[PDB]
Amino acid sequence: MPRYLGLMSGTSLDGMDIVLIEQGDRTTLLASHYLPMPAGLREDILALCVPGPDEIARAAEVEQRWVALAAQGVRELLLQQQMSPDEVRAIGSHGQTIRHEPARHFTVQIGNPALLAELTGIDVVADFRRRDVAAGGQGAPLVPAFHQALFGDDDTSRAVLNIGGFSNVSLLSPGKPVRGFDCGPGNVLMDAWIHHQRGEHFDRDGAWAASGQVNHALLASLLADEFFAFNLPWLQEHLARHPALPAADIQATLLELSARSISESLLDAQPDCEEVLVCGGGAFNTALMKRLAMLMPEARVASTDEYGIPPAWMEGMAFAWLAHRFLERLPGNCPDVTGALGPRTLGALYPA
Amino acid sequence: MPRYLGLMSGTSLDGMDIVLIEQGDRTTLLASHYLPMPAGLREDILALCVPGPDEIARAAEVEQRWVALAAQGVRELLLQQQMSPDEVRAIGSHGQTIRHEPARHFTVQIGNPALLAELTGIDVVADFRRRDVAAGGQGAPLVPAFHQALFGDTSRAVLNIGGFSNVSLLSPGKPVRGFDCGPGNVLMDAWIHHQRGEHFDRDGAWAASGQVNHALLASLLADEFFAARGPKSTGRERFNLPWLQEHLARHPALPAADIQATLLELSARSISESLLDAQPDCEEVLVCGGGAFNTALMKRLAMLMPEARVASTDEYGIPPAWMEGMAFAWLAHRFLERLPGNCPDVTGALGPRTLGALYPA
Numbered sequence: 001m002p003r004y005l006g007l008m009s010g011t012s013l014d015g016m017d018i019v020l021i022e023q024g025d026r027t028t029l030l031a032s033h034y035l036p037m038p039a040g041l042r043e044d045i046l047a048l049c050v051p052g053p054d055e056i057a058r059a060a061e062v063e064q065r066w067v068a069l070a071a072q073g074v075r076e077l078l079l080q081q082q083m084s085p086d087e088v089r090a091i092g093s094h095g096q097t098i099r100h101e102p103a104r105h106f107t108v109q110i111g112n113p114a115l116l117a118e119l120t121g122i123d124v125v126a127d128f129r130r131r132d133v134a135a136g137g138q139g140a141p142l143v144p145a146f147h148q149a150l151f152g153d154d155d156t157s158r159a160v161l162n163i164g165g166f167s168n169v170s171l172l173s174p175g176k177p178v179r180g181f182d183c184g185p186g187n188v189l190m191d192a193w194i195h196h197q198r199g200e201h202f203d204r205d206g207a208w209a210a211s212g213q214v215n216h217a218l219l220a221s222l223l224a225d226e227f228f229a230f231n232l233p234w235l236q237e238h239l240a241r242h243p244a245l246p247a248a249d250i251q252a253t254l255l256e257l258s259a260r261s262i263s264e265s266l267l268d269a270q271p272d273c274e275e276v277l278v279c280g281g282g283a284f285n286t287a288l289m290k291r292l293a294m295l296m297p298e299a300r301v302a303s304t305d306e307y308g309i310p311p312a313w314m315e316g317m318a319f320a321w322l323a324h325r326f327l328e329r330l331p332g333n334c335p336d337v338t339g340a341l342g343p344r345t346l347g348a349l350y351p352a
Numbered sequence: 353m354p355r356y357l358g359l360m361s362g363t364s365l366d367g368m369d370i371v372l373i374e375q376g377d378r379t380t381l382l383a384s385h386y387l388p389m390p391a392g393l394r395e396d397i398l399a400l401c402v403p404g405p406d407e408i409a410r411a412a413e414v415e416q417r418w419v420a421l422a423a424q425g426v427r428e429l430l431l432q433q434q435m436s437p438d439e440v441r442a443i444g445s446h447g448q449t450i451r452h453e454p455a456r457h458f459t460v461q462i463g464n465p466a467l468l469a470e471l472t473g474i475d476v477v478a479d480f481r482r483r484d485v486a487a488g489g490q491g492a493p494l495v496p497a498f499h500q501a502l503f504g505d506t507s508r509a510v511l512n513i514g515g516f517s518n519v520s521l522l523s524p525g526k527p528v529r530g531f532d533c534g535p536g537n538v539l540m541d542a543w544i545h546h547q548r549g550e551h552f553d554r555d556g557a558w559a560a561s562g563q564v565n566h567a568l569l570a571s572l573l574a575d576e577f578f579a580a581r582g583p584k585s586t587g588r589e590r591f592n593l594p595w596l597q598e599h600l601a602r603h604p605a606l607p608a609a610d611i612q613a614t615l616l617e618l619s620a621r622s623i624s625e626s627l628l629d630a631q632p633d634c635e636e637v638l639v640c641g642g643g644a645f646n647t648a649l650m651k652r653l654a655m656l657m658p659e660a661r662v663a664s665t666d667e668y669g670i671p672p673a674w675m676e677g678m679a680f681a682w683l684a685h686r687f688l689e690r691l692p693g694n695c696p697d698v699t700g701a702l703g704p705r706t707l708g709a710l711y712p713a
């Protein structure tokens with residue numbers, strides 16, 4: 001049964017996930033490999049995520065470094081697994097988003113797929129998002145179709161919660177269409193605050209947020225944002241029209257904002273939820289997971305580890321799956337979730 | 353007997369070329385459809401050809417407008433030809449080049465292929481240059497492979513004169529060679545557009561009136577791009593208006609029409625010398641692209657290359673205008689048959705590669 005590579009680099013810019021999957025009747029993880037994002041490239045990618053000068057030249061250079069890194073990591077992984085390139089049918093690559101504007105009908109994932117094919121000797125499928133957007137959709141999330149396949153329990157009301165930058169959920173309710181929406185911010189404000197404040201990337205184990213006192217006025221104002229009816233300056237805006245607060249108290253609050261936006265949105269739509277299956281790097285924020293567990297007391301909260309699949313690799317595995325879907329010519333979007341006009345074949349094929 | 357669509361919009365920005373071919377034991381042109389480029393889009397594309405602010409959003413918005421006009425074109429041609437999209441195996445889309453810098457190992461062509469597949473309901477092969485650039489090449493010219501399959505006894509020179517000029521050298525026995533000679537219409541277009549409104553000197557009429565200036569002529573040739581042998585893509589020196597005005601400034605003042613006449617000569621000469629250097633045995637010079645409807649330039653190339661016959665491709669049963677478009681339709685065929693697209697000694701890439709990517713309907 002065919003073998004696929006998945007290449008994920010999310011907008012938290014933490015590193016590159018590479019997965020080896022096998023796609024029979026079952027998806028299965030054969031191996032995984034993590035490339036921590038180097039300091040220079042992270043900041044360079046970051047500086048492409050806002051409008052600025054000379055972007056086309058600059059994106060071309062960044063792209064080349066990103067791809068050389070991806071290709072380095074693919075090779076590393078194959079060698080370590082004792083596999084030839086030709087044992088892999090294709091790479092499913094997400095690329096790297098530097099712009100996502102579904103209101104202006106565009107989304108931009110750099111990733112020179114053609115160089116990746118050149119450097120790996122493997123067929124690449126990339127540029128998954130643009131066809132959904134071309135079809136009247138948001139081009140995101142793409143994971144809900146994959147969640148359904150991978151968890152097809154026509155018994156329990158499972159809910160699959162990805163906490164990266166942003167929290168997004170896939171509600172699997174026996175004998176119905178899957179649903180999907182964005183809860184709100186995941187790690188993105190928590191990273192942003194402890195980055196602004198100290199220079200750190202994230203708040204390991206939710207330790208800094210746990211050492212602080214929740215502010216309720218700030219929290220109430222945050223939760224009252226229109227979205228529910230998300231960058232540092234947005235949060236510096238809210239910090240204006242309140243008392244000055246200790247740094248930890250803002251982190252604590254930010255962590256509560258994440259946990260409550262999740263909680264309300266998920267029992268508001270699937271109130272009889274047996275299992276919340278957490279995946280993504282927010283699964284490792286023990287402190288946030290504690291709070292999710294309390295605000296969902298009569299539901300079992302845990303990572304996808306409990307049901308067989310490590311949470312850090314979920315998204316990596318999904319893009320491997322989308323390569324498979326592309327080549328089998330089977331829809332990769334869920335239009336109900338994306339707003340697309342219907343089922344679309346997602347991606348393009350760059351043959352080795 | 354597969355049919356393919358070819359979509360071309362070159363650096364001259366005259367408009368979009370849409371061609372339909374049948375690929376069998378050879379390539380037959382079935383239909384042509386030309387779209388004039390809206391003056392809005394033309395200037396917005398030109399605005400993306402130099403470094404600038406907010407290029408990602410800008411180009412993404414320009415691309416939407418470009419794809420909308422391309423699909424409108426495809427839909428019109430199909431209807432007018434009484435065929436449905438199902439009858440077409442694929443569109444070969446060149447996109448629109450906004451930045452070509454092989455020396456920085458990148459080429460950027462826009463024209464959102466996913467949205468093109470969405471709007472036409474036809475599979476799209478796009479983004480042909482990037483694999484060749486990825487494997488060390490210049491990413492251009494890509495037409496030689498096609499020129500060879502069309503017109504491959506005879507030592508032939510197949511000459512495209514668009515914005516720039518490129519020559520395929522079809523030497524019986526030896527590998528297919530060739531390179532960007534340099535300026536075709538680009539400078540003559542730009543001078544008559546600086547001086548006056550219009551985007552090109554119809555028939556070489558303005559140029560013919562004027563008289564060449566040998567001092568200016570001698571200088572422009574004196575340039576670093578021209579002496580370079582083998583794999584080269586125009587832009588080792590960017591032939592553009594700022595390039596010329598500089599040269600104008602270091603000489604005394606001259607009439608406009610003389611400058612045009614000199615520009616005309618510069619294209620004729622760079623072609624001659626670069627072409628003859630590499631193939632003095634050349635017997636026929638087959639000329640395509642819009643430069644072939646320039647009467648002056650054509651008559652002048654004849655003279656500069658006496659030992660061979662200089663005729664446009666219509667006399668070999670292919671209209672000059674549609675040669676590039678047919679080549680991108682043919683590249684979609686090659687992609688779909690997994691047959692090489694580049695000629696590596698032309699491009700200077702490591703070896704043969706299948707070019708492009710598939711965005712399926």
Ligand SMILES: Nc1ncnc2c1ncn2[C@@H]1O[C@H](COP(=O)(O)OP(=O)(O)NP(=O)(O)O)[C@@H](O)[C@H]1O
Nearest residue numbers: 010011012164165187202204205280281282284285
């Ligand atoms: N031990 C940990 N403690 C706390 N937070 C952690 C820990 N490990 C990872 N994280 C968080 O998880 C984030 C990365 O999660 P990840 O799922 O890779 O996000 P992403 O790359 O943005 N993908 P996406 O969800 O597609 O946007 C990091 O930036 C941290 O905020």
Ligand SMILES: Nc1ncnc2c1ncn2[C@@H]1O[C@H](COP(=O)(O)OP(=O)(O)NP(=O)(O)O)[C@@H](O)[C@H]1O
Nearest residue numbers: 362363364365514515516537552554555641642646
């Ligand atoms: N009647 C004419 N007389 C003289 N020149 C003409 C005439 N018609 C077209 N041209 C020239 O031909 C050019 C267009 O040629 P074309 O082959 O379409 O260029 P292009 O494809 O945009 N460039 P490139 O990217 O190098 O292929 C125009 O810009 C004019 O300079």
Ligand SMILES: [Mg+2]
Nearest residue numbers: 009010014015
């Ligand atoms: Mg990540």
Ligand SMILES: [Mg+2]
Nearest residue numbers: 361362364366
């Ligand atoms: Mg043209």
